[PDB]
Amino acid sequence: FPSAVTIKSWVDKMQEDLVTLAKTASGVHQLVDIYEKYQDLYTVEPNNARQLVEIAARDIEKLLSNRSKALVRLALEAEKVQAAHQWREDFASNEVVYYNAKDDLDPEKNDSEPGSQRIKPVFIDDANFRRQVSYQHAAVHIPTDIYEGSTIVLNELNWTSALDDVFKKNREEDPSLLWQVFGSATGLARYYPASPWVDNSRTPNKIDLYDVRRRPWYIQGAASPKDMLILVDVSGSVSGLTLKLIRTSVSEMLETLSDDDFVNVASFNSNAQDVSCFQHLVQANVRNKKVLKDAVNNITAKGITDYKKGFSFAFEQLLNYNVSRANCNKIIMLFTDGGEERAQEIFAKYNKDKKVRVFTFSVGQHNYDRGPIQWMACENKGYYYEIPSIGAIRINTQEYLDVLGRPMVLAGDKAKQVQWTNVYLDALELGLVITGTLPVFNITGQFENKTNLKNQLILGVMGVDVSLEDIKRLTPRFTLCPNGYYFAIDPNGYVLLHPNLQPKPIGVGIPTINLRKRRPNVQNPKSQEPVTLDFLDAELENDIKVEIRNKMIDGESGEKTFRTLVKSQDERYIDKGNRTYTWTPVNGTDYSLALVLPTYSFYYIKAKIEETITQARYSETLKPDNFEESGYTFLAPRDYCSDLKPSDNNTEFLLNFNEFIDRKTPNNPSCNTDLINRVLLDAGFTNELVQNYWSKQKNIKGVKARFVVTDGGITRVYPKEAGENWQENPETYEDSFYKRSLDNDNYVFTAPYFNKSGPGAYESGIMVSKAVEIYIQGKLLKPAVVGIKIDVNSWIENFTKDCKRNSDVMDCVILDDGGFLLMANHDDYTNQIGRFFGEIDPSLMRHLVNISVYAFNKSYDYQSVCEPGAASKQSCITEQTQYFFDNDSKSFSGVLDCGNCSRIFHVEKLMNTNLIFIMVESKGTCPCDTRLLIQAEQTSDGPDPCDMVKQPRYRKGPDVCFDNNVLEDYTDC
Amino acid sequence: MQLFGGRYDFEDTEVRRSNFDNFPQALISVFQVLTGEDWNSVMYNGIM
Numbered sequence A: 001f002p003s004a005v006t007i008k009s010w011v012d013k014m015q016e017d018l019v020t021l022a023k024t025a026s027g028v029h030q031l032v033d034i035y036e037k038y039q040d041l042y043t044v045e046p047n048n049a050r051q052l053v054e055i056a057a058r059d060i061e062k063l064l065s066n067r068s069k070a071l072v073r074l075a076l077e078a079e080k081v082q083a084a085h086q087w088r089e090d091f092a093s094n095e096v097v098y099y100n101a102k103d104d105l106d107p108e109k110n111d112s113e114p115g116s117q118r119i120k121p122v123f124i125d126d127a128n129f130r131r132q133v134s135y136q137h138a139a140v141h142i143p144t145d146i147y148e149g150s151t152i153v154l155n156e157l158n159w160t161s162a163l164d165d166v167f168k169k170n171r172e173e174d175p176s177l178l179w180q181v182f183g184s185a186t187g188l189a190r191y192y193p194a195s196p197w198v199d200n201s202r203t204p205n206k207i208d209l210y211d212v213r214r215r216p217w218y219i220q221g222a223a224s225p226k227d228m229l230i231l232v233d234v235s236g237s238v239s240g241l242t243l244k245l246i247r248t249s250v251s252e253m254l255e256t257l258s259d260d261d262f263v264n265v266a267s268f269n270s271n272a273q274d275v276s277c278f279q280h281l282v283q284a285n286v287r288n289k290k291v292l293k294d295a296v297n298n299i300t301a302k303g304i305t306d307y308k309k310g311f312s313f314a315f316e317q318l319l320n321y322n323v324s325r326a327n328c329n330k331i332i333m334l335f336t337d338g339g340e341e342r343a344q345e346i347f348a349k350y351n352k353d354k355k356v357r358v359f360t361f362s363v364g365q366h367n368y369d370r371g372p373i374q375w376m377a378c379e380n381k382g383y384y385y386e387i388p389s390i391g392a393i394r395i396n397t398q399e400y401l402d403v404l405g406r407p408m409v410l411a412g413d414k415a416k417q418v419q420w421t422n423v424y425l426d427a428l429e430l431g432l433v434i435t436g437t438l439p440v441f442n443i444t445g446q447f448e449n450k451t452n453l454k455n456q457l458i459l460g461v462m463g464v465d466v467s468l469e470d471i472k473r474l475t476p477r478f479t480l481c482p483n484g485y486y487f488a489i490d491p492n493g494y495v496l497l498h499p500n501l502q503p504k505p506i507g508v509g510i511p512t513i514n515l516r517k518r519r520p521n522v523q524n525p526k527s528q529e530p531v532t533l534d535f536l537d538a539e540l541e542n543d544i545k546v547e548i549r550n551k552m553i554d555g556e557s558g559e560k561t562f563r564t565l566v567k568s569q570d571e572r573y574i575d576k577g578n579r580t581y582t583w584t585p586v587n588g589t590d591y592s593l594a595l596v597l598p599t600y601s602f603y604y605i606k607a608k609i610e611e612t613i614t615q616a617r618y619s620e621t622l623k624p625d626n627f628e629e630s631g632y633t634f635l636a637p638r639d640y641c642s643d644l645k646p647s648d649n650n651t652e653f654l655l656n657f658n659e660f661i662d663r664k665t666p667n668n669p670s671c672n673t674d675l676i677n678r679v680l681l682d683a684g685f686t687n688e689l690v691q692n693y694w695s696k697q698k699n700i701k702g703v704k705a706r707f708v709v710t711d712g713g714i715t716r717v718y719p720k721e722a723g724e725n726w727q728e729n730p731e732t733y734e735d736s737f738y739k740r741s742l743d744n745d746n747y748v749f750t751a752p753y754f755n756k757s758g759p760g761a762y763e764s765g766i767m768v769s770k771a772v773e774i775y776i777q778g779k780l781l782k783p784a785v786v787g788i789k790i791d792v793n794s795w796i797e798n799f800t801k802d803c804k805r806n807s808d809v810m811d812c813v814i815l816d817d818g819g820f821l822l823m824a825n826h827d828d829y830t831n832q833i834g835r836f837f838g839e840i841d842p843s844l845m846r847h848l849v850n851i852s853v854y855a856f857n858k859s860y861d862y863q864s865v866c867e868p869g870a871a872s873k874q875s876c877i878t879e880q881t882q883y884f885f886d887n888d889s890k891s892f893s894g895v896l897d898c899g900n901c902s903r904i905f906h907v908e909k910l911m912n913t914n915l916i917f918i919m920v921e922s923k924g925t926c927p928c929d930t931r932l933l934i935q936a937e938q939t940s941d942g943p944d945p946c947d948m949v950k951q952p953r954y955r956k957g958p959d960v961c962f963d964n965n966v967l968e969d970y971t972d973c
Numbered sequence B: 001m002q003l004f005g006g007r008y009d010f011e012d013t014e015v016r017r018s019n020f021d022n023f024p025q026a027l028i029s030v031f032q033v034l035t036g037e038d039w040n041s042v043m044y045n046g047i048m
């Protein structure tokens, strides 16, 4: 085994060889030279990240105040309009004309139900809606089990028809506005503009079971947040059909709950245990509810019924005050069949003043006495609900919000506050969106205070979407580098706006569906959960980020600079990036907005080119017939002008881009000058490289392909044969290697993938990249990332000439940080190239981490898909490992032993690059396995919830809670 | 009422109305099996 100085001297002649090959062939110092040679085609402006945040915080203020004004007027009209409605019952005499969504639009149908008359609308196709729509009226959604033509429903479509004039007045004023909808108390919803619903009832074989009342946006503006507590009666009498019904009501009751709502679930049979692991009221987020809905299911009925120990346990649960709580409506609901005891004594003290509200549910078909339960409900200002059937569950476990809304409708105007929802997928397929809601109240005869019998309910709730693609147009990231971004946050820790946030719903648990019990054609529910990713789950968690995260939940302003490690774009690397954060509150709302920058991004380039010939000359550089002397040029699909659209077929896009500058001068009076201009300047900078430097050295021996991925989207792979293999995203702010090249001050090597499809190994090769780094007036700039795809065959020859090709004495390999295998001596390893090195000899890799040579961090990706397990895709959690050098020390000697054998490995790290060289004795001499240490998205179901909630994350609830008005009717059950 | 009272605590959504829960009901059930009509259903439920 060679000495430590021989490995030292032999690494230094093959890290000097790779870097000279990459410093020379790519042209780092040449592209630095021509950014500095000009100085005057551009100027260098600063990103004032105090100022940028303040500017952004105000476009989201004004956007969400403009939405709010529209909401207020609609509400006023609805209140005024229905106070002048006459309650007619002759509807076959005077037809109600409306367009009904989810109905066949074929003219020849002509069903013509009594009372109603439909509309055939004309349906232009649209952008900002990715569906055909009509701007002349509002559609109407009736849920499926609700009959339309009922006097109760027919009378909504009469009075609600005056909203189409106010609907129209909102979009005339603001073209950008998205869905406008009124969700009725009656269960009928009207939205503008009209479009056909996505599931028709019976024209396909999937049938929608969508109810407006059920909806989260409808619920948050229906009522105030609430600490509920479900009691379940588990006595012996319940076992049977009735027990079956209860498990489906509680799961149903929960759907109703929200993050702001706290909830626990207890159960009694002569003792009250608590159904799961929790013991206090927990946040009823997606996860906690998933635990409770998984413990409600396993319940077995046995034993004597005791309503006294069931309501003692409930009240005690209600009084914890140590835990984090909603502290608003306090209510307890019991599911039971029949009661012989009213438990008068427990209610006298625990709730002598009736602070708590009791709702009693009688379920199943049975003969047990219901008088005592009704009495309990009446005594406590709750309500009573029967459920005999499965189809009766859905409208009675949502109906309690008519009771809880009462002291809000007695609060008057004070209760008309806009609230904005958690991001969620739109019913109509719009994408991620948030809705601002306002409740409409039933005011009839207010002038004189004549009735009030049913004047304590809301007419319904009114909402208006903001799409998250509308907010991302108020937070522009182009001046800032790929590293910089804006993050938005609730007072709940959830992230409103984040690079990491994705359309797929956030998943819980490992998905298990039983194929042996899905009959083929019945169509179960798909999903309704909100997409609540948290800030400490969108990014790698620190302790110096939980400080930042708490500090901008409680509405403060500030900046912070620290060293933290960024997870890479692809999930394979972790790079220590020195960042600065800066946050401020959006003053109209409860959102607070932040901005990450990396020091060195504090300055950007603005293009200062305006000459006729110079913008002209740089623009034919990106012509696809002129790639024989330029290099297969790419171009990023920014929204350059409003007219040319991002196309995802890039040769399509670059023609429509470059047609645009010929057919019209780049002045373009409805199009931003700087973004297009910077691109033009850039293409004259990645031209002078490809003309005056790369086309001189037309073939370097080991060099396969040469790229300049730059800022302005223009990536230039140098031979067109090589550009067929360029499998990157052509958007330069989505490339992984672009972003890892900017963090590092040394050449970076990217490992090719293992297996997969497409040619990514011998054909393209392993790639090196390096950020360009210029100084203008003593101000750092990193405009572009040069690079090289390496030839893996040639590199091997230099490497071969104490390691032979195929040696049995000892094997040596080169590994980039992250532990991936790039170059291998054996030839059974270099076939499996770009593979995680702990999968080809897991014994050595395990030891290396122990020596402190390597470090890692497992994280959770709450938005990913996986195949089900037997117990096409669902959402699930994956755990993800990344590996990264944590020790700066250059060399590491030692020996590892498996038991009865030693192997002496020597590790040396090449200077000036992330690569590491290790020499070790052949694996075959000691037959050892430990277990195969693998690095992949690995399906898992963590972290366990029962341990998170003992020390929950900081949170801030709603300031205004409406409950317990003294003059509430409290007489109807 | 001893052997079958309670005891029809099945978790099906169907009705077995000729059951032995009360005394009036048990009496009605006993009589139906004497008229012979559909007594096999009343026996199948007692085995399940």
Ligand SMILES: *[C@@H]1O[C@H](CO)[C@@H](O[C@@H]2O[C@H](CO)[C@@H](O)[C@H](O[C@@H]3O[C@H](CO)[C@@H](O)[C@H](O)[C@H]3NC(C)=O)[C@H]2NC(C)=O)[C@H](O)[C@H]1NC(C)=O
Pocket: A017, A018, A020, A021, A024, A697, A700, A701, A702, A703, A794, A795, A798
């Ligand atoms: C493997 O090792 C070889 C030899 O060191 C290395 O070589 C290429 O080697 C030749 C041998 O002299 C170099 O001349 C050649 O470099 C160029 O010519 C002169 C030499 O001083 C200088 O201008 C630069 O070194 C460089 N510039 C040129 C010619 O444009 C050198 N480079 C190539 C690729 O031909 C291989 O690169 C090593 N294997 C790799 C690529 O890792």
Ligand SMILES: *[C@@H]1O[C@H](CO)[C@@H](O[C@@H]2O[C@H](CO)[C@@H](O[C@@H]3O[C@H](CO)[C@@H](O)[C@H](O)[C@@H]3O)[C@H](O)[C@H]2NC(C)=O)[C@H](O)[C@H]1NC(C)=O
Pocket: A081, A094, A095, A158, A159, A160, A161, A162
């Ligand atoms: C709910 O539906 C009823 C029935 O369609 C609507 O009442 C109708 O309202 C219109 C305009 O308010 C009435 O038109 C007026 O007719 C009189 C003659 O009757 C004429 O002198 C006026 O110049 C005008 O043309 C219509 O007659 C009336 N129908 C009845 C039976 O009274 C009502 O408008 C709908 N509510 C909403 C909010 O849309």
Ligand SMILES: *[C@@H]1O[C@H](CO)[C@@H](O[C@@H]2O[C@H](CO)[C@@H](O[C@@H]3O[C@H](CO)[C@@H](O)[C@H](O)[C@@H]3O)[C@H](O)[C@H]2NC(C)=O)[C@H](O)[C@H]1NC(C)=O
Pocket: A082, A087, A442, A443, A444, A451, A452, A453, A454, A455, A459
């Ligand atoms: C808003 O509140 C008002 C009352 O404050 C509600 O109006 C009431 O609606 C009921 C519906 O059951 C009407 O009662 C019906 O009367 C007819 C006679 O026309 C009778 O045939 C029915 O059997 C039933 O008793 C009642 O007339 C009406 N009250 C008033 C004062 O107009 C209204 O329904 C609420 N708004 C919404 C959208 O529900």
Ligand SMILES: *[C@@H]1O[C@H](CO)[C@@H](O[C@@H]2O[C@H](CO)[C@@H](O)[C@H](O)[C@H]2NC(C)=O)[C@H](O)[C@H]1NC(C)=O
Pocket: A053, A054, A055, A057, A058, A584, A585, A587
């Ligand atoms: C958000 O609103 C606050 C006030 O509630 C603004 O703070 C003020 O800032 C101005 C100068 O910008 C000072 O003159 C005032 O004294 C500040 N307010 C108070 C009460 O001291 C803040 O600038 C606003 N920020 C944004 C982004 O809109």
Ligand SMILES: *[C@@H]1O[C@H](CO)[C@@H](O[C@@H]2O[C@H](CO)[C@@H](O)[C@H](O)[C@H]2NC(C)=O)[C@H](O)[C@H]1NC(C)=O
Pocket: A541, A855, A856, A857, A858, A886
């Ligand atoms: C992420 O990895 C880093 C390794 O660099 C961890 O940081 C070290 O954590 C240990 C305890 O696990 C401390 O003793 C060291 O002082 C830390 N070193 C540095 C440089 O921070 C970090 O804990 C990991 N994060 C997680 C969540 O495991």
Ligand SMILES: *[C@@H]1O[C@H](CO)[C@@H](O)[C@H](O)[C@H]1NC(C)=O
Pocket: A059, A062, A063, A066, A173, A174
């Ligand atoms: C807000 O409304 C005003 C007035 O219609 C308009 O000028 C402005 O552009 C709107 N802002 C946003 C972000 O929609």
Ligand SMILES: *[C@@H]1O[C@H](CO)[C@@H](O)[C@H](O)[C@H]1NC(C)=O
Pocket: A563, A576, A577, A578, A743
């Ligand atoms: C982080 O900050 C220190 C001190 O300002 C600086 O020396 C270091 O270069 C920064 N980190 C990186 C990766 O540049």
Ligand SMILES: *[C@@H]1O[C@H](CO)[C@@H](O)[C@H](O)[C@H]1NC(C)=O
Pocket: A850, A851
């Ligand atoms: C290093 O390995 C030793 C022996 O296997 C072990 O006791 C120790 O915990 C390891 N160090 C770390 C950091 O895990």
Ligand SMILES: [Ca+2]
Pocket: A235, A236, A237, A238, A304, A305, A338
């Ligand atoms: Ca009972």
Ligand SMILES: [Ca+2]
Pocket: B036, B037, B038
């Ligand atoms: Ca018969």
